[PDB]
Amino acid sequence: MRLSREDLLERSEVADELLTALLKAGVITTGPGGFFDEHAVVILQCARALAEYGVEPRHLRAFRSAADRQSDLIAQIAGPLVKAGKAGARDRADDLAREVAALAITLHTSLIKSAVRDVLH
Amino acid sequence: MRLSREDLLERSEVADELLTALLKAGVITTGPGGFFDEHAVVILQCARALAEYGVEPRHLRAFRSAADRQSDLIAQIAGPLVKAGKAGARDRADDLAREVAALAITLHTSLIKSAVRDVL
């Protein structure tokens, strides 16, 4: 989805001032057309909950820098697979790259959960 | 959630060689108690599927590197909340620290999904 700023605030139930803080810290960004996506809703809701635990938007800036680097590693794997999707009537040619990107994200997420478990216990 | 190496191989359904390679490369590890967790099963499952698409275990090292650094940032945010847990009559409670850690991971995952969709 393509959400305006106001659409994002309504869906997230977060204050405009928190969104402004997250934008100015580079944590959240608009997509290339200047809209927000569905992930922005979740990011803003998590950021609000985290602010309530004393974590200010500027302290999430590292998460974003790391996410961008990981996204590039994932694109290296999935990008060349865009052309390899089945293109029959019933197919959509992007599905294979999406599947591969999703596997990589799941892998990565699980690695972080694992590493966190270990450092907190 | 405390899995032996055999439990991990049977649950993940991957070849012994793949696990061996992932261990050697540092991508998968046991916890401090010496065993594997439920996350290891998912990691192995995903790694096998990714291998089928071209991704060698060696190539997953960059993922592991990054995940460890992210866990260190998460520990810095969540670690101080261990002592703030709602222990009740107990001496300890890590539930707040776990919640903060879970939020942070969700946020980070969502940041990745957003960036991937943009790049692709």
Ligand SMILES: CCC[C@@H](CC(C)(O)O)[C@@H](CO)C[C@H](O)CCCCC(=O)O
């Ligand atoms: C939200 C759940 C995951 C997310 C995974 C992805 C594409 O970001 O890696 C996907 C679900 O597969 C969101 C979109 O529904 C997929 C549209 C195709 C875009 C793509 O190929 O990257």
Ligand code: NA
């Ligand atoms: Na956009």
